[PDB]
Design a protein around this ligand. Sequence first.
Ligand SMILES: *[C@@H]1O[C@H](CO[C@H]2O[C@H](C)[C@@H](O)[C@@H](O)[C@@H]2O)[C@@H](O[C@@H]2O[C@H](CO)[C@@H](O)[C@H](O)[C@H]2NC(C)=O)[C@H](O)[C@H]1NC(C)=O
Ligand SMILES: *[C@@H]1O[C@H](CO)[C@@H](O[C@@H]2O[C@H](CO)[C@@H](O)[C@H](O)[C@H]2NC(C)=O)[C@H](O)[C@H]1NC(C)=O
Ligand SMILES: [Zn+2]
Lengths: 213, 220
Amino acid sequence: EIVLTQSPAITAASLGQKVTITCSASSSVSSLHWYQQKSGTSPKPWIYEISKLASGVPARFSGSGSGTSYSLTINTMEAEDAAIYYCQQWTYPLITFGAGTKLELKRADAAPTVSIFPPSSEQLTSGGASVVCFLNNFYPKDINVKWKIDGSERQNGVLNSWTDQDSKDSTYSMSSTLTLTKDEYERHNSYTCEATHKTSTSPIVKSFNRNEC
Amino acid sequence: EVKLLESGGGLVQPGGSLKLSCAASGFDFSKYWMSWVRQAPGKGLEWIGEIHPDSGTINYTPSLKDKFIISRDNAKNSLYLQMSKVRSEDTALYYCARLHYYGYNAYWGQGTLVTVSAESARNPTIYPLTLPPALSSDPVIIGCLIHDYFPSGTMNVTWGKSGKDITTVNFPPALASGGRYTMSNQLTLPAVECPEGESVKCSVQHDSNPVQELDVNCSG
Ligand SMILES: *[C@@H]1O[C@H](CO[C@H]2O[C@H](C)[C@@H](O)[C@@H](O)[C@@H]2O)[C@@H](O[C@@H]2O[C@H](CO)[C@@H](O)[C@H](O)[C@H]2NC(C)=O)[C@H](O)[C@H]1NC(C)=O
Ligand SMILES: *[C@@H]1O[C@H](CO)[C@@H](O[C@@H]2O[C@H](CO)[C@@H](O)[C@H](O)[C@H]2NC(C)=O)[C@H](O)[C@H]1NC(C)=O
Ligand SMILES: [Zn+2]
């Protein structure tokens, strides 16, 4: 009935810079509140009744607005402020939540550190073989991973998982798992994980050779 | 102090029905308006509805009016949610919250997960991630592969060592083809902190199940 538009949807701010995010309503609302949500946590009550700060909210935060357009401001962006921010209106008998604003901490470019892990003897016993590649502490978030088995590309059985922005480092991490059978693993010798990122012209390659033993 | 604890979540068959409960303590439950909120994996917050302290007025999100029934006891200090013809689409964390004036969710529970699937439950198998002497070092990277489990639930992963230069990275679960999840946990520490012959324990807790422990070697 009442639509809330949060803008920008995805934003970035550097450390110590002033950030303003907005929440606008399709019609007049009785009240508006803000909530912060991080990675594996319940939403935290942040700003209530347009400008009141909830229990342990830092003084750098402020809420403003009336009628239809509302704002959330961070005077000095801190690393720990990297989160999703949700606005919510109340107009009896309805409660509506905006789609959220993802706020990222803008940091310096950083090349990923690649590590490659061969399958466990424990897993091999089971007749399974997962080859794991970790790509750590990179910025910006955008990355492309490729797997090669005996110099040729492998697409199927690849599981990718991206981390959350670290809020001490302001970096991202990624995991890429190639799962094969023990028979399929033992049929090939070289395993390679290659990452394409803006910080390098060429791919960041990490490989291992399984032979003899 | 105020506490809200949801229970009743878990695996439910598509087209099934379940009742969720939210136990409230540390406040006089009977005086407050209570609500339910849901969040599908990777999606935003969606209001289900609210209940008046003395059960007379129940307000819902118009679209959801047709599959959810909010109720409360007051004696039992419990809030309930009945979900009737559950779709895969209904898979989400369900949160109960205590409402304040101006429709603010002042206190929230930790949420209970509802997984609408036909696929059977499966416990994870934990495997060590260690590299041979001639493959890495300084810093040392070790890990625990938490493999082929369902449903996703809540995974608690703790390591035997902690410090200033010891970093833990818990990778969010990834769903394979079969319909089984895998996660990995990684520990980065200075080589001096994880010498050859030594090990670090990874402690995994899937939902309310007993902890599964693995001793991971610093070097292969
Ligand atoms: C399930 O979780 C707790 C983690 O407890 C808290 O501490 C972290 C820093 C905080 O962010 C919140 O998550 C909680 O307040 C585990 O506790 C730790 O585990 C070991 C036992 O193996 C203890 O010896 C540690 O001291 C303890 N806490 C700290 C300081 O991190 C709890 O055991 C875990 N379950 C498992 C075994 O995985
Ligand atoms: C929640 O409670 C209020 C009670 O006022 C309901 O509001 C009434 O119903 C309709 C649509 O909201 C209005 O056209 C009436 O004028 C309202 N008020 C009266 C006279 O009490 C509201 O519908 C309730 N329910 C939910 C499910 O939205
Ligand atoms: Zn009221």
